[PDB]
Ligand binder design. Structure first.
Ligand code: NDP
Ligand code: NDP
Ligand code: NDP
Ligand code: NDP
Ligand code: KMK
Ligand code: KMK
Ligand code: KMK
Ligand code: KMK
Lengths: 261, 263, 261, 256
């Protein structure tokens, strides 16, 4: 009776608001983290205090690399994340692919580039593929009679990547791949009634002289969004209200994509 | 202190579902109709029964023509629709441009019914959306900022399947493509008044020989069926809600994945 | 023997350049104009000098207004009639004519009714009616007498997904024209009529700092295009080389659509 | 000198037709291949028989795997661009054609599919683009060519995904993101970056697939695609950048 969400990069910022919002709706929440161990553990205790046995935390590098104990592939670590929900609670109804690295990969003007490829592509595109695969296998290997009634996968994409940010080619490619995954997984998982949608923020919860300048670009309100302005949309899309939506991406950008230089 | 929604073509189908959903969230609803008087009036009696003074009905042909006098323009009729909300309740917070003509206009056939077809399919789908949006905008801009609503939201009912056009339906496909540009253009220009403008684009909703109903339905990837009206209108209500307040300029497909298909 | 093109708003700027490039490729050209009868008579003369009986001129208002009543749809069949009249054919239609002026929502009834018919007539309604006229003509040519390369190009706008503030009527009419392209492409494919769009950004563009400011924002070259930068694309899409391309819109915009405020 | 084009996967089919097309236009062509040595070398022979010194061949696995001396994909790709500069001193045009294509079903190792499908389609194209841009950047303004053009071969139909081809579809989506981001970033150096998206092309159970095509009810010939790649590289398309041109006979307009 209590559904389970797995939220990647759940420790802070938008991933934390997504986990908080799903939890508010009655979900048990698997809080994935990579480096933010203290934040993830504090968030868990907050939600477990509000509602016993309502949250767990699991650590994984979603980079496209191996990790030592066979060195452990990204694939294995992805199946293991999904397995953690099944092991704790016997289900996993919602997957939010939120975790994402983001930093410049300039084409113009070290082995960091292999590091960058692995990290940006892994977190943003390849781990989402492997997570959705493990998610879908687990639904597929549940007898029909016992399947949940509202399986939902949300990919966090980017409303502004048709208007790329100068110098972020690999990240922009990765988001594009992610949008690809949304359409391909919606089509292919439809027979198991698993919906696959994207949410794309424009500017959200910006870190002062420059904050002010970015803020002023947004037609609506001339500010970046709050975390909850994004997560409320994620929450709606996972709801039974949205049960006819799949294969689609929703921009939550204040009209930022409508602007031109 | 009760919010007001104007829903066009509210009498039946999707427009009635949207009207009932907004009503359920505590909107007073102004139900526009053209031909469907009996249905609209019964819808409004149901709503007023549930909550006094929470609905009215207004008639207007949104076809881009002049109507019965010196002659009345579509503009005027549109502005009068908005002014009906303001006359009765003193506000208009939401507008759902739902009303819409749909019928083939094939490029290859071979006369007054060519001129009234463009007027009807273009008016209902695009130009009346424009004028109602401009009349709606005018009212807000008119209100001292101290008396303005805090959640203004315009929704335009577009078509998920317009990039994959239905054979023979060119004017209709065009007018929907128009409606998408108004959605984007209005979102931009009305952002300073915090008027959000978005689209909702159904695929197959509330759909012939029945093996051809069963035939069309089966092509949708999710559930192999057309949607319920609620499956569409819940999305409309979400975009109107204060939880959607950073959303503007976007269209949301509700198509069960239909737009993902190829022949 | 010599293929015919019909080009609307052919008298100046981009439409003149399209008429020339088709003229240069050896089309006989029907130069449509509305107000600029001089410039058109001028151009006709020039190309009728390079080559006898290779250019004609034709006047019509493509606004959605009945004239002295003659409805828009008959003036459009008239235009198409005039190529078959003179030359016995019409192989190419370019819907280039377009009025363009602000129709703002805020700030500041005679005006408004005239803008609706002018902006939607010219950008959208007449193109519809012209295509209809053109398709019926081909349909009513026995197959064995049809030309081998029918091509319609609609001049759309690269930048309409990023609307120009205060231009809604225009932006809507361009989105109808996009609709027209895909819809006609699909419908006319059996006739082997190809229908495509070409979408300029800033082309052949207040205080000089303003002009420069606008030009400065184009990523590639930091300027507006020339007529020929656009007309070359049009002529390619009409060439037998593009014979597998229908239903598609080609941006010619120097990257401008890739920018954000 | 004559301008030079690098075409990846140039041995057969579209990639050969492109090579041929640019050659017939006056380009000297670097013909990249992976497994099709014999075909690549026959092409080059025909090409050099036509105009001496106008074709060469280079082999490279564009899968994202560290190869044997270990040699990474970055290195392989940079070297590929250096082969142009080494033999002809210039590289004017890059066509990212090379592409692996096979199912990666979500419902029925993965390691190799991922490195191969994302490398050929997405990660190699980026390193190739970056190598190209670095070689242009480092050329003194005075001696830079006057018509830099990069063509990504994308897919017109990827918004309408082929069931079971998730990784391929993702990789062509990455390649679309590369087209735009590289077009923006390399615009100041006057390198245009564009995509061409085939529908069904040169289908190798077939009349079923091609009858879905609105225009002519067939798949395209190889020329009906390469001619488009040729035009976009030409100076007549010098204002077109960031753009993808579908060449699909209208197939992307269909629905089930
Ligand atoms: N903020 C904005 O304005 C925008 C956001 N978005 C998208 O929304 C999503 C959420 O945004 P935001 O909150 O700003 O994200 P953040 O950049 O703050 O990061 C989210 C989390 O991702 C995790 N992560 C990063 N790299 C890896 C990796 N290699 N392996 C595993 N986990 C990793 C980190 O977890 P940990 O801290 O535990 O290491 C991090 O806290 C992202 O997908 C982003 O692309 C899109 C548009 C703009
Ligand atoms: N149903 C579907 O599968 C899809 C629907 N949509 C869109 O969703 C919306 C609602 O769809 P649906 O419920 O099927 O729409 P309907 O065709 O059922 O029409 C809704 C109402 O539009 C009104 N209307 C039509 N023309 C005019 C006009 N000239 N002037 C005034 N009102 C007019 C009618 O009111 P009356 O009866 O009072 O005369 C009608 O009941 C539309 O905008 C539609 O295009 C999009 C794609 C798919
Ligand atoms: N130039 C640019 O930057 C851009 C251009 N485009 C599109 O490219 C095309 C050409 O651009 P450009 O040359 O600058 O356009 P212009 O503004 O120069 O106009 C083209 C011609 O359209 C004709 N026209 C205008 N209104 C009417 C009408 N009501 N009835 C009949 N003919 C009419 C005029 O003919 P006459 O003079 O004979 O009256 C005019 O010369 C247009 O479709 C435009 O929308 C798109 C984006 C930007
Ligand atoms: N043909 C079609 O209908 C469609 C094609 N396209 C796109 O058009 C382009 C050309 O299509 P098409 O000619 O059919 O392509 P092919 O499937 O024939 O592949 C082209 C070449 O790619 C090379 N290649 C494949 N994998 C690798 C790799 N791991 N490393 C290096 N080279 C590799 C091969 O080289 P070698 O043979 O030497 O090993 C191959 O011959 C592709 O990018 C494709 O996605 C788009 C959609 C439809
Ligand atoms: C504000 O920081 C500063 O003061 C300066 C330091 C350098 N700097 C940036 O690194 C930067 C940071 C965030 C930016 N964001 C605007 C959205 C662009 O997509 C915020 C954003 C944040 N974190 C993010 N994390 C993921 N995984 N993905 C995303 N998109 C993301 N985005 C843009 C540029 C801007 C100026
Ligand atoms: C009297 O009708 C007949 O003779 C039949 C044969 C022809 N015929 C159609 O052409 C037809 C009807 C409805 C169709 N719908 C599919 C959605 C297309 O967008 C359902 C749909 C319904 N009503 C609709 N009303 C608006 N205002 N807009 C929409 N899109 C709409 N759509 C499609 C084709 C079915 C009915
Ligand atoms: C101080 O600031 C100013 O000077 C303002 C004065 C008013 N103003 C303009 O008049 C104006 C004029 C032409 C503009 N063009 C390109 C912008 C479109 O994104 C040039 C263009 C020309 N003529 C055109 N004619 C058709 N039929 N269609 C097209 N698209 C068209 N376009 C832009 C703005 C904007 C700014
Ligand atoms: C009778 O059953 C069989 O033998 C089937 C075996 C599996 N099978 C396919 O794998 C297949 C092959 C070619 C297909 N093409 C239509 C375009 C799909 O996007 C042609 C295409 C060709 N080669 C290609 N190579 C790259 N690198 N990329 C592309 N897209 C590509 N496409 C589609 C499916 C269908 C035939």
């Amino acid at each position: 009776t209590v559904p389970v969400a797995l939220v990647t990069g759940a420790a802070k910022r938008l991933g934390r608001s997504i986990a908080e919002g799903l939890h508010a709706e009655g979900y048990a929440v698997c809080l994935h983290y990579h480096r933010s161990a203290a934040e993830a553990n504090a968030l868990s205790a907050t939600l477990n205090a509000r509602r016993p046995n309502s949250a767990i935390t699991v650590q994984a590098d979603l980079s496209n690399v191996a990790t030592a104990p066979a060195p452990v592939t990204l694939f294995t670590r992805c199946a293991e994340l999904v397995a953690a929900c099944y092991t704790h609670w016997g289900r996993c109804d919602v997957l939010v692919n939120n975790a994402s690295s983001f930093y410049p990969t300039p084409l113009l003007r070290r082995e960091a580039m292999e590091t960058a490829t692995a990290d940006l592509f892994g977190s943003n595109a390849i781990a989402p593929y492997f997570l959705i695969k493990a998610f879908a296998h687990r639904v597929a290997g549940t007898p029909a009679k016992h399947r949940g009634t509202n399986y939902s996968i949300i990919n966090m994409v980017d409303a502004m990547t048709n208007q790329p940010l100068l110098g972020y080619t690999i990240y922009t490619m990765a988001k594009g791949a992610l949008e690809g995954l949304t359409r391909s997984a919606a089509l292919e998982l439809a027979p198991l009634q698993i919906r696959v949608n994207g949410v794309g923020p424009g500017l959200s919860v910006l870190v002062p002289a420059v904050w002010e300048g970015h803020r002023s670009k947004v037609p609506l309100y001339q500010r970046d969004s709050s975390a909850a302005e994004v997560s409320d949309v994620v929450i709606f899309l996972c709801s039974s209200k949205a049960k006819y939506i799949t294969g689609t991406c929703v921009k939550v950008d204040g009209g930022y994509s409508l602007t031109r230089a």
